[PDB]
Amino acid sequence: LIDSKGYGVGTPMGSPYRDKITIAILQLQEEGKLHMMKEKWWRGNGCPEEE
Amino acid sequence: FMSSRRQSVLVKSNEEGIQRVLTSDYAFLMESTTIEFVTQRNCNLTQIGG
Numbered sequence: 001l002i003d004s005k006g007y008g009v010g011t012p013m014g015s016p017y018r019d020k021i022t023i024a025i026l027q028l029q030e031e032g033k034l035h036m037m038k039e040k041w042w043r044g045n046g047c048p049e050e051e
Numbered sequence: 052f053m054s055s056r057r058q059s060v061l062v063k064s065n066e067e068g069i070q071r072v073l074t075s076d077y078a079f080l081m082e083s084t085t086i087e088f089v090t091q092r093n094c095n096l097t098q099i100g101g
């Protein structure tokens with residue numbers, strides 16, 4: 001990687017439900033919900049390289 | 052580099068920093084006296100540079 005940035009769920013300026021999504025995303029990272037979704041969409045075809 | 056790579060190459064302790072050299076290609080910067088203690092107790096490390 002060259003840079004290191006991140007995507008994010010956008011909220012309006014000074015919103016209370018920014019904090020509840022902040023708690024929600026970190027819950028799904030520990031139980032592995034996002035990694036089961038990242039392997040579901042960015043994969044989908046096992047390639048050949050194996051050499 | 053270190054301003055752009057915070058929480059990636061910026062470890063918070065010496066014991067986790069020597070271990071990070073022991074895992075990956077890591078070039079940890081620290082004081083010279085402790086390097087002279089670790090290198091004499093670990094034969095998989097060295098002090099390169101002055």
Ligand SMILES: *[C@@H]1O[C@H](CO)[C@@H](O)[C@H](O)[C@H]1NC(C)=O
Nearest residue numbers: 070073074092093094095096
């Ligand atoms: C490097 O140092 C020790 C002692 O020389 C060696 O036995 C071992 O292979 C290495 N230690 C690791 C990989 O933790």
